[PDB]
Design an enzyme around this catalytic site. Structure first.
Site, PDB file in Angstrom:
ATOM      1  N   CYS A  55      28.410-113.699 -51.840  1.00 48.44           N
ATOM      2  CA  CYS A  55      28.147-112.577 -52.722  1.00 48.44           C
ATOM      3  C   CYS A  55      27.347-112.982 -53.962  1.00 48.44           C
ATOM      4  O   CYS A  55      27.481-114.104 -54.455  1.00 48.44           O
ATOM      5  CB  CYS A  55      29.461-111.927 -53.145  1.00 48.44           C
ATOM      6  SG  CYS A  55      29.206-110.419 -54.091  1.00 48.44           S
ATOM      7  N   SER A 107      30.427-104.005 -56.442  1.00 46.18           N
ATOM      8  CA  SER A 107      31.432-104.460 -55.491  1.00 46.18           C
ATOM      9  C   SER A 107      32.824-104.371 -56.122  1.00 46.18           C
ATOM     10  O   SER A 107      33.200-105.208 -56.944  1.00 46.18           O
ATOM     11  CB  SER A 107      31.149-105.907 -55.096  1.00 46.18           C
ATOM     12  OG  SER A 107      29.768-106.111 -54.868  1.00 46.18           O
ATOM     13  N   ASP A 139      27.059-110.083 -48.944  1.00 46.52           N
ATOM     14  CA  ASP A 139      27.110-108.998 -49.893  1.00 46.52           C
ATOM     15  C   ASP A 139      26.228-109.446 -51.041  1.00 46.52           C
ATOM     16  O   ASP A 139      26.670-109.615 -52.191  1.00 46.52           O
ATOM     17  CB  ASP A 139      28.544-108.741 -50.363  1.00 46.52           C
ATOM     18  CG  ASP A 139      28.630-107.583 -51.357  1.00 46.52           C
ATOM     19  OD1 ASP A 139      27.935-106.562 -51.139  1.00 46.52           O
ATOM     20  OD2 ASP A 139      29.391-107.690 -52.351  1.00 46.52           O
ATOM     21  N   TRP A 157      22.618-108.991 -53.302  1.00 48.55           N
ATOM     22  CA  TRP A 157      21.770-107.934 -53.801  1.00 48.55           C
ATOM     23  C   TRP A 157      20.731-108.550 -54.699  1.00 48.55           C
ATOM     24  O   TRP A 157      20.969-109.583 -55.302  1.00 48.55           O
ATOM     25  CB  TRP A 157      22.611-106.923 -54.568  1.00 48.55           C
ATOM     26  CG  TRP A 157      23.244-107.478 -55.808  1.00 48.55           C
ATOM     27  CD1 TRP A 157      22.661-107.615 -57.033  1.00 48.55           C
ATOM     28  CD2 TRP A 157      24.598-107.926 -55.955  1.00 48.55           C
ATOM     29  NE1 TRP A 157      23.566-108.111 -57.937  1.00 48.55           N
ATOM     30  CE2 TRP A 157      24.764-108.311 -57.306  1.00 48.55           C
ATOM     31  CE3 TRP A 157      25.686-108.036 -55.078  1.00 48.55           C
ATOM     32  CZ2 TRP A 157      25.975-108.798 -57.806  1.00 48.55           C
ATOM     33  CZ3 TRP A 157      26.892-108.522 -55.576  1.00 48.55           C
ATOM     34  CH2 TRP A 157      27.025-108.896 -56.931  1.00 48.55           C
TER      35      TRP A 157
HETATM   36  C1  LIG Z   1      24.907-103.156 -52.864  1.00 54.69           C
HETATM   37  C2  LIG Z   1      24.772-103.694 -54.140  1.00 54.69           C
HETATM   38  C3  LIG Z   1      25.848-104.361 -54.712  1.00 54.69           C
HETATM   39  C4  LIG Z   1      25.834-104.685 -56.064  1.00 54.69           C
HETATM   40  N1  LIG Z   1      26.935-105.195 -56.634  1.00 54.69           N
HETATM   41  C5  LIG Z   1      26.958-105.418 -57.955  1.00 54.69           C
HETATM   42  C6  LIG Z   1      28.110-105.913 -58.557  1.00 54.69           C
HETATM   43  O1  LIG Z   1      29.206-105.737 -58.027  1.00 54.69           O
HETATM   44  N2  LIG Z   1      28.070-106.332 -59.892  1.00 54.69           N
HETATM   45  C7  LIG Z   1      26.882-106.242 -60.625  1.00 54.69           C
HETATM   46  O2  LIG Z   1      26.821-106.715 -61.759  1.00 54.69           O
HETATM   47  N3  LIG Z   1      25.731-105.730 -60.016  1.00 54.69           N
HETATM   48  C8  LIG Z   1      25.773-105.326 -58.676  1.00 54.69           C
HETATM   49  N4  LIG Z   1      24.738-104.651 -58.152  1.00 54.69           N
HETATM   50  C9  LIG Z   1      23.571-104.335 -59.007  1.00 54.69           C
HETATM   51  C10 LIG Z   1      23.711-102.938 -59.617  1.00 54.69           C
HETATM   52  O3  LIG Z   1      23.804-101.964 -58.576  1.00 54.69           O
HETATM   53  C11 LIG Z   1      22.512-102.620 -60.514  1.00 54.69           C
HETATM   54  O4  LIG Z   1      21.311-103.001 -59.838  1.00 54.69           O
HETATM   55  C12 LIG Z   1      22.633-103.384 -61.835  1.00 54.69           C
HETATM   56  O5  LIG Z   1      23.910-103.107 -62.416  1.00 54.69           O
HETATM   57  C13 LIG Z   1      21.516-102.958 -62.793  1.00 54.69           C
HETATM   58  O6  LIG Z   1      21.460-101.530 -62.832  1.00 54.69           O
HETATM   59  P1  LIG Z   1      20.959-100.719 -64.132  1.00 54.69           P
HETATM   60  O7  LIG Z   1      20.912 -99.289 -63.754  1.00 54.69           O
HETATM   61  O8  LIG Z   1      21.777-101.114 -65.300  1.00 54.69           O
HETATM   62  O9  LIG Z   1      19.467-101.282 -64.372  1.00 54.69           O
HETATM   63  P2  LIG Z   1      18.159-100.585 -63.739  1.00 54.69           P
HETATM   64  O10 LIG Z   1      17.674 -99.547 -64.677  1.00 54.69           O
HETATM   65  O11 LIG Z   1      18.446-100.220 -62.333  1.00 54.69           O
HETATM   66  O12 LIG Z   1      17.087-101.782 -63.745  1.00 54.69           O
HETATM   67  C14 LIG Z   1      17.154-102.817 -62.763  1.00 54.69           C
HETATM   68  C15 LIG Z   1      15.785-103.494 -62.711  1.00 54.69           C
HETATM   69  O13 LIG Z   1      15.422-104.036 -63.989  1.00 54.69           O
HETATM   70  C16 LIG Z   1      14.476-105.086 -63.719  1.00 54.69           C
HETATM   71  N5  LIG Z   1      14.979-106.289 -64.418  1.00 54.69           N
HETATM   72  C17 LIG Z   1      16.393-106.686 -64.572  1.00 54.69           C
HETATM   73  N6  LIG Z   1      16.241-107.793 -65.540  1.00 54.69           N
HETATM   74  C18 LIG Z   1      14.941-108.032 -65.701  1.00 54.69           C
HETATM   75  C19 LIG Z   1      14.335-108.927 -66.477  1.00 54.69           C
HETATM   76  N7  LIG Z   1      15.128-109.649 -67.263  1.00 54.69           N
HETATM   77  N8  LIG Z   1      13.018-109.167 -66.410  1.00 54.69           N
HETATM   78  C20 LIG Z   1      12.253-108.455 -65.480  1.00 54.69           C
HETATM   79  N9  LIG Z   1      12.916-107.513 -64.686  1.00 54.69           N
HETATM   80  C21 LIG Z   1      14.236-107.318 -64.820  1.00 54.69           C
HETATM   81  C22 LIG Z   1      14.462-105.268 -62.207  1.00 54.69           C
HETATM   82  O14 LIG Z   1      13.437-104.447 -61.626  1.00 54.69           O
HETATM   83  C23 LIG Z   1      15.825-104.724 -61.826  1.00 54.69           C
HETATM   84  O15 LIG Z   1      15.826-104.308 -60.452  1.00 54.69           O
HETATM   85  C24 LIG Z   1      24.722-104.377 -56.840  1.00 54.69           C
HETATM   86  C25 LIG Z   1      23.628-103.744 -56.260  1.00 54.69           C
HETATM   87  C26 LIG Z   1      23.653-103.398 -54.913  1.00 54.69           C
HETATM   88  C27 LIG Z   1      22.542-102.798 -54.329  1.00 54.69           C
END
Ligand SMILES: Cc1cc2nc3c(=O)[nH]c(=O)nc-3n(C[C@H](O)[C@H](O)[C@H](O)COP(=O)(O)OP(=O)(O)OC[C@H]3O[C@@H](n4cnc5c(N)ncnc54)[C@H](O)[C@@H]3O)c2cc1C
Ligand SMILES: Cc1cc2nc3c(=O)[nH]c(=O)nc-3n(C[C@H](O)[C@H](O)[C@H](O)COP(=O)(O)O)c2cc1C
Ligand SMILES: Nc1ncnc2c1ncn2[C@@H]1O[C@H](CO)[C@@H](O)[C@H]1OP(=O)(O)O
EC number: 1.6.2.4
Length: 602
Positions: free
Chosen positions: A554, A386, A599, A601
């Site tokens: 949010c 966001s 908003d 997620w």
């Molecule tokens: C529309 C929307 C808005 C968002 N806005 C923001 C924002 O503004 N700021 C922000 O910080 N994030 C936000 N996000 C989240 C962001 O898009 C990512 O999901 C986040 O940054 C993690 O992505 P990654 O690729 O680093 O991890 P990924 O490789 O995508 O892994 C994520 C997955 O790891 C697993 N996981 C996470 N921690 C653990 C744990 N400790 N134990 C077990 N499972 C866990 C879960 O399955 C999680 O879904 C938003 C997501 C969406 C969909």
């Protein structure tokens, strides 16, 4: 608005296709499904095809009957419609065509934590029948809050039988081509769309042609050592990109190099071998799985997903490459709809959160051809954030507020978020983040005098850092601004209070009429944002009932957002008076009249 293909019905004829699965997808999963269902028609003595409903004229369903024992399946996700399924929708609304003779099925993908669960699916399956088509199988309702994969294996198991029976029919999707003589500039190296599009940046920048923006600021917002919350500043100069607070920025990251090296290392092969996977259906739009020609290493780094728990359909197909019997059998039974096989998958793969490499390490007899493995891997999706700034103040910069993901998994190893570990590694100088912006409807009121109530603990702060920069800016421009209240929250005020200074300064200048924080761990009881909302209930009901204020939420969707909605149900039930039901309706109505925006997620 793209150029439509030729009537799909005619296409199916010319290739002897009798089943066409259409996928409405936003992050690939619906699509992945439609393709799995597509190759499924084969084992059943049928041939099908996946297709993007955007690239076709859905009015042509009316002609499908003219193919023998034709069948159309719809795998639709709700986001109502996803970008690519918008045409279909507006059509399903305008049209009045007579689909008599069309046979359909629908498997929707949603998440129960959402207000409108599987709204898209429920709609499609219920409108086709309104037009004259006949449902062949029950509407599938997938819940990504439980396990979507399992809901899908459960539906697909009762689907195919009902189909083969109905039609009386008896019970490598792509091909590999290694490259020996390839010109060096004709090889994709990670760019998303047009070749060399990354190196030679050419506007307009969107999902297919992302604008590599320069990371001008990287900082840690927290004082602790346990977690790593950070604030980055991407520079979108000369990008010609317009944005407003509430909008999201999307970024294509890179997988961890060693997780990549070790994958080709264990499989005993080279990742630099330039290749191409040409869709065996020579007539299909999706000619390749990803940008080809390209080297495995590149694909494993920029186009493939090597960290998420593999799906059941991938494991099944890799079963044949494990020598040891015991293992082969395990990979084979991962796709069961019940039993010890459904249990090992949910605990050993999902719960344990074992990525592709891990499984290859824990099942050493599994040594598949890295070729069939890349065709099986899902595409690497971009991650959303966001935007945390006002474009009235920072027209040329997009701010992101995020927490880095790194945790210990039962799998035995430490997992790291793809996007976060990556942006974390990027600091101002050679740091380019491939990106683009997606418009959203989370927006500051049209009128400046309209009150605003923002609720967003933890990272849910970031959109509001914009709303505040904008509200403040409107006042300086002499505009008359109504109340602007923030309801933020963190563990402790001296450990992870994000933007403490900026928010103090804003309260000081009078931008923030009220700065209500909740320090969760600063005392025996947990004090959350909703506790503050209940606290200021009398005054908040005033704004809502008499001030026409907008509400915003949010951050965590899982619980925080539900808890706050429920507390708003109570504030109204009390000052209405009303009984929680009439208050729920009242709050929801506020959501349709655009006075309550979310908003959240997972
Ligand atoms: C529309 C929307 C808005 C968002 N806005 C923001 C924002 O503004 N700021 C922000 O910080 N994030 C936000 N996000 C989240 C962001 O898009 C990512 O999901 C986040 O940054 C993690 O992505 P990654 O690729 O680093 O991890 P990924 O490789 O995508 O892994 C994520 C997955 O790891 C697993 N996981 C996470 N921690 C653990 C744990 N400790 N134990 C077990 N499972 C866990 C879960 O399955 C999680 O879904 C938003 C997501 C969406 C969909
Ligand atoms: C911003 C956002 C909004 C969503 N809104 C809904 C919704 O209204 N209803 C629902 O059932 N699921 C909703 N979901 C969940 C998705 O429908 C679910 O995760 C689906 O599996 C995604 O499929 P895809 O990869 O094919 O797009 C939402 C997810 C995101 C990220
Ligand atoms: N269910 C919930 N409702 C509101 N805030 C929550 C919440 N669960 C956790 N929080 C708080 O959200 C803030 C940002 O993560 C933290 O103060 C966290 O407190 P906790 O970790 O002590 O539960």
């Amino acid at each position: 608005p793209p150029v439509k293909e030729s009537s799909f019905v005619e296409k199916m004829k010319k290739t002897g296709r009798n089943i066409i699965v259409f996928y409405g997808s936003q992050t690939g999963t619906a699509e992945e499904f439609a393709n799995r269902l597509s190759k499924d028609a084969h084992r059943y003595g049928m041939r099908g095809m996946s297709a993007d409903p955007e690239e076709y004229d859905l009015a042509d369903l009316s002609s499908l009957p003219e193919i023998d024992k034709s069948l159309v399946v719809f795998c639709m996700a709700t986001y109502d419609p996803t970008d690519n399924a918008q045409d279909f929708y507006d059509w399903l609304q305008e049209t009045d065509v007579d689909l008599t003779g069309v046979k359909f099925a629908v498997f929707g993908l949603g998440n129960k934590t959402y207000e409108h669960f599987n709204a898209m699916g429920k709609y499609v399956d219920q409108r086709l029948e309104q037009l004259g088509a006949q449902r062949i199988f029950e509407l599938g309702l997938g819940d990504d809050d439980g396990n979507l994969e399992e809901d899908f294996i459960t539906w697909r198991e009762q689907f195919w039988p009902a189909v083969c029976e109905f039609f009386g029919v008896e019970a490598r999707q792509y091909e590999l081509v290694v490259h020996e003589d390839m010109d060096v500039a004709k090889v994709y190296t990670g760019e998303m769309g047009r070749l060399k599009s990354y190196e030679n940046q050419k506007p307009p920048f969107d999902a297919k042609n992302p604008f590599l923006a320069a990371v001008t600021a990287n900082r840690k917002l927290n004082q602790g050592t346990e977690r790593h919350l950070m604030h980055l500043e991407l520079d979108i100069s000369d990008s010609k990109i317009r944005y407003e607070s509430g909008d999201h920025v999307a970024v294509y990251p890179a997988n961890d190099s060693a997780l990549v090296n070790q994958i080709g290392e264990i499989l005993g092969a080279d990742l630099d071998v330039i290749m191409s996977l040409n869709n065996l259906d020579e007539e299909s739009n999706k000619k390749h799985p990803f940008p080809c020609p390209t080297t495995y290493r590149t694909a494993l780094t920029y186009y493939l997903d090597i960290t998420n728990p593999p799906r059941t359909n991938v494991l099944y197909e890799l079963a044949q490459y494990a020598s040891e019997p015991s293992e082969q059998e395990h990979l084979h039974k991962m796709a069961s709809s019940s039993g010890e096989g459904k249990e090992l998958y949910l605990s050993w793969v999902v719960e344990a959160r074992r990525h592709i490499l891990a499984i290859l390490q824990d099942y050493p007899s599994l040594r598949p051809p890295i070729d069939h493995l890349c065709e099986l891997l899902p595409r690497l999706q971009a991650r959303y954030y966001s935007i945390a700034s006002s474009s009235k103040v920072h027209p040329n910069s997009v701010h992101i507020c995020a927490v880095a993901v790194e945790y210990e998994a039962k799998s035995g190893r430490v997992n790291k978020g793809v996007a976060t570990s990556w942006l974390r590694a990027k600091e101002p100088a050679r740091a380019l983040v491939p990106m683009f912006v997606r418009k959203s409807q989370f927006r500051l009121p049209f009128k400046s005098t309209t009150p605003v109530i923002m609720v967003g603990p933890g990272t849910g702060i970031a959109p509001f850092m914009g709303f505040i920069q904008e509200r403040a800016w409107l006042r300086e421009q002499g505009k008359e601004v109504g109340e602007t209240l923030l309801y933020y929250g963190c563990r402790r005020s001296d450990e992870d209070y994000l933007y403490r200074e900026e928010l103090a300064r804003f309260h000081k200048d009078g931008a923030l009429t009220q700065l209500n924080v909740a320090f969760s761990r600063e005392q025996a009881h947990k004090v959350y944002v909703q506790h503050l909302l209940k606290r200021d209930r009398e005054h908040l009901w005033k704004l809502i009932h008499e001030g026409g204020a907008h509400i915003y939420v949010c951050g965590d969707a899982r619980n925080m957002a539900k808890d706050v909605q429920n507390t708003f149900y109570d504030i109204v039930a009390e000052f209405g008076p009303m009984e929680h039901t009439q208050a729920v309706d009242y709050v929801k109505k506020l959501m349709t009249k655009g006075r309550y925006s979310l908003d959240v997620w997972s």
